[PDB]
């Protein structure tokens, strides 16, 4: 009855969303052609939150897909679940962006943005009582970062009080996979720190660390990595999707965990992760989850929070579990480690339980932690950005087609203040 409109952006955005609708479908129990055939009706009583209905029970996912290169937009139409998105919603680009961000923002970004707005207001009129919007992109490319920043800039004209999340792919600290990446990344955050009410941070090499160490998978392709992050983005939007004992939807997660409106850069992780060796071995009780989420090793953004302090953390608990057990086992993470928790907030943790687990497991949980560790991330790009601006490296691919050099220096001041904002709240 209250629902979320999914909307993707870029080749990385499309490839994430093809494995996000791949994992929400048969947890609701949906065949590859769109007819509900699941077991119990409890998954059916609020199927409308992420799905839409048509003639004869043929269900339609309501996601709005945009990409500029049509050679990889057809890759998800040929996938196993490619035949459930209605092909009116595919908004293809006739020519690619070229990984310069302002092409995605000014020259060939503004050409398609009339059409992408045409399908959402057609869809949002058909919505009953809309709640939020959901976005996936990578920062590293003009197809994903440039397009999304133009969408979120003037979606705040029409839908101001709708609660927006964006699930970014921040560039990895060791190897960033584009040469002229940090011009795009530093210019993206200025449209991020004022518009988006929440934003997440998924380091690409921190997921590589998980298949390095925890799962120790032999041969992980992007099908495996997209599945590891798609479970995390299902755990957030769940307490409005099933009943629970102490529920918490997107508004209750937002107003209860950011302290100040330009301080909202998050850091997620998903709790039960086990290799094939240790799965025969592993304990399964409620403090075994507090090992996983509060391990800095199991954290899908790169920076370890031993270098900084948490402000507020979140922990939603999908499962049928004792309430006291969670509550007892949350102070005992605060007490033995009280040097990584700030002092002008009395209690830090946020509690949420939902009865229905992921399909088969006993319990599962998702951690979202607002940290000052991320200034050690944001100090890196700002130094990385200055090394290519002062000597004017790769300048003319942005100057001659878009804005002048002031927009870079303005984006420095939008970036330098935030790193000073984190540090001032690191010791108050």
């Amino acid at each position: 009855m209250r629902e979320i409109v999914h909307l993707q952006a870029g080749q990385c955005g499309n490839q994430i969303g093809a494995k996000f609708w791949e994992v929400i479908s048969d947890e609701h129990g949906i065949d590859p052609t769109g007819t509900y055939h699941g077991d119990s009706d409890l998954q059916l009583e609020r199927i409308n939150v992420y799905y839409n209905e048509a003639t004869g029970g043929k269900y339609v996912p309501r996601a709005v897909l945009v990409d500029l290169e049509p050679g990889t937009m057809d890759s998800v139409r040929s996938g196993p679940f490619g035949q459930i998105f209605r092909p009116d919603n595919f908004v293809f680009g006739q020519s690619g962006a070229g990984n310069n961000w302002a092409k995605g923002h000014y020259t060939e970004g503004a050409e398609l943005v009339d059409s992408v707005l045409d399908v959402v207001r057609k869809e949002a009129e058909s919505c009953d009582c809309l709640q939020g919007f959901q976005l996936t992109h990578s920062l590293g490319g003009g197809t994903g970062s440039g397009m999304g920043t133009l969408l979120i800039s003037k979606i705040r004209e029409e839908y101001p009080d709708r609660i927006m999340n964006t699930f970014s792919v921040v560039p990895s600290p060791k190897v960033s996979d584009t040469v002229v990446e940090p011009y795009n990344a530093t210019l993206s955050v200025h449209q991020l720190v004022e518009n988006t009410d929440e934003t997440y941070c998924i380091d690409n090499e921190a997921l590589y660390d998980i298949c390095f160490r925890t799962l120790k998978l032999t041969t992980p392709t992007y099908g495996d990595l997209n599945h590891l992050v798609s479970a995390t983005m299902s755990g957030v939007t769940t307490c409005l999707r099933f009943p629970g004992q102490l529920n918490a939807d997107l508004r209750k997660l937002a107003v209860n965990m950011v302290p100040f409106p330009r301080l909202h850069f998050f850091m997620p992780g998903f709790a039960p992760l086990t290799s094939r060796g240790s799965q025969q071995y592993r304990a399964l009780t409620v403090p075994e989850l507090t090992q996983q989420m509060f391990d800095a090793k199991n954290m899908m953004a790169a920076c370890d929070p031993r270098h900084g302090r948490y402000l507020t953390v979140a922990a939603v608990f999908r499962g049928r579990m004792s309430m006291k057990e969670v509550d007892e086992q949350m102070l005992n993470v605060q007490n033995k480690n009280s040097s990584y928790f700030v002092e002008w907030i009395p209690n830090n943790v946020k509690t949420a339980v939902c009865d229905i687990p992921p399909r088969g497991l006993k319990m599962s949980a998702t951690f979202i932690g607002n940290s000052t560790a991320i200034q050690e991330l944001f100090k890196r790009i700002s130094e990385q950005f200055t090394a290519m601006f002062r000597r004017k490296a790769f300048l003319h691919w942005y100057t001659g087609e878009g804005m002048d050099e002031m927009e870079f220096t303005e984006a420095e001041s939008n970036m330098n203040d935030l790193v000073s904002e984190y540090q001032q709240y690191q010791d108050a």
């Binding site: 190897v175 040469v179 990446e181």
Partner: protein, 430 residues
């Protein structure tokens, strides 16, 4: 929707293209008559169940083009898209740009407008030429003006054969490289450079073959262009389209010369012996023996490198392989451009042609970079242009062939200012 047009100029452009389309007509199962019992990027469907590649072959001499029209491919090709001439340029930029090419420009442009009318979404051109002779300097420079005034924002990416230091064919090649580097600096969007003598130096040592011909060499150059364009049509985990390479390897419009190196050129007998992972192969392009450039980049510093992979290459094993290569002190980065890298992964394993000296190994990488070290290569070439022009040695044909002596001294100032631009880059900024 992603149609790309390859135009071949000169003998070296068209003899590359004879082996180039042999590769493209085998990775798609095309009989050499033309039939076939996502290929529309390079091939054009007719109404009669027939495929024709979207290309234009242009030359100033019939003796190289008549074997195309009586070869084993004479019916796959369109009868008119092959263009001829009647009076040879004879190794002269003055003759390939002011005398002959002005009577053979009005038809080549006429066809390529129509060959873009089949398309809806064109994004790239491919001009194939060599910097040694007339038509490969004069005629290739004349068209780059003409494509630019008609198209503009289309990204035309090129392939060039450099005159090597030690070996040469002509004696008026060092004029014709400099005399085209003026006009083809304002009007080209990239420039790939592979010289003969560092295909010659590779082909003796890593392959068992000695004493080759250009049909063995163009099976490499045909493979290096197919390794670039393969991401357009075959789906992969990290695909990079052809219009992307401009903004990642060209920092400044005066510096648009990246270089090429294809790593697993090993014998079909010696494909048996080594494991070819991805961690073994991202280092081998930086080996001093294995570059197709006779400039050791140890003399310079790597500007930016783009890497592209084919076949069963996984993105976990390439991120671990690429982080190691900048941890060593052998491979050199400095402060002003510290990322440098972008990757390309494709799911099509590289095919083999009969008679090719390659092998069907499933992990092949091409390396695409520019260094600081090209500046010492031109340091011969501006010098060698001055040993001739100090007694105005071979300009005597050029003055009579329609252009004056005034552009030669202007070729000094434009080229000498390019050399100082590289040492502006290499000096540290503190």
């Amino acid at each position: 929707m992603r149609e790309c047009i390859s135009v071949h100029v000169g003998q070296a452009g068209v003899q590359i293209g004879n082996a180039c389309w042999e590769l493209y007509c085998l990775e798609h199962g095309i009989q050499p008559d033309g039939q076939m019992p996502s290929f529309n990027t390079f091939f054009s469907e007719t109404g009669a169940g027939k495929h024709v590649p979207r290309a234009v072959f242009v030359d100033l001499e019939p003796t190289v083009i008549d074997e195309v029209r009586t070869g084993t491919y004479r019916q796959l090709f369109h009868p008119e898209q092959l263009i001829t001439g009647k009076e040879d340029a004879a190794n002269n930029y003055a003759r390939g740009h002011y005398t002959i090419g002005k009577e053979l420009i009005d038809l080549v442009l006429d066809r390529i407008r129509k060959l873009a009318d089949q398309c809806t979404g064109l994004q790239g051109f491919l001009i194939f030429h060599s910097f040694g002779g007339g038509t490969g300097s004069g005629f290739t420079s004349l068209l780059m003006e003409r494509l630019s005034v008609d198209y503009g924002k289309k990204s035309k990416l090129e392939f060039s054969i450099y005159p090597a230091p030690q070996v040469s064919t002509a004696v008026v090649e060092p004029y014709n490289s400099i005399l085209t580097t003026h006009t083809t600096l304002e009007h080209s969007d990239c420039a790939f450079m592979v010289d003969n003598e560092a295909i010659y130096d590779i082909c003796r040592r890593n392959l068992d073959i000695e004493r080759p011909t250009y049909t063995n060499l163009n099976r490499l150059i045909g493979q290096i262009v197919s390794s670039i364009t393969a991401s357009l049509r075959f789906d992969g985990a990290l695909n990079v389209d052809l219009t992307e390479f401009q903004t990642n390897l060209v920092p400044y419009p005066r510096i648009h010369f990246p270089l090429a190196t294809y790593a697993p050129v090993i014998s079909a007998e010696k494909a048996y012996h080594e494991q070819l992972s991805v961690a073994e192969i991202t280092n081998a392009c930086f080996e001093p023996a294995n570059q197709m450039v006779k400039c050791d980049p140890r003399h310079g510093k790597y500007m930016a490198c783009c890497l592209l992979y084919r076949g069963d290459v996984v993105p976990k094993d390439v991120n671990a392989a690429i982080a190691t290569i900048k941890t060593k002190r052998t491979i050199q980065f400095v402060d002003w451009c510290p990322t440098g890298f972008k990757v390309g992964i494709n799911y099509q394993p590289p095919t083999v042609v009969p008679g090719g000296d390659l092998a069907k190994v499933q992990r092949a990488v091409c390396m695409l970079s520019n260094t600081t070290a090209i500046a010492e290569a031109w340091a011969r070439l501006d010098h060698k242009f001055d040993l001739m022009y100090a007694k105005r040695a071979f300009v005597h044909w050029y003055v009579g062939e329609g252009m004056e002596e005034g552009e030669f001294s202007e070729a000094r100032e434009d080229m000498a200012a390019l050399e100082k631009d590289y040492e502006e880059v290499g000096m540290d900024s503190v």
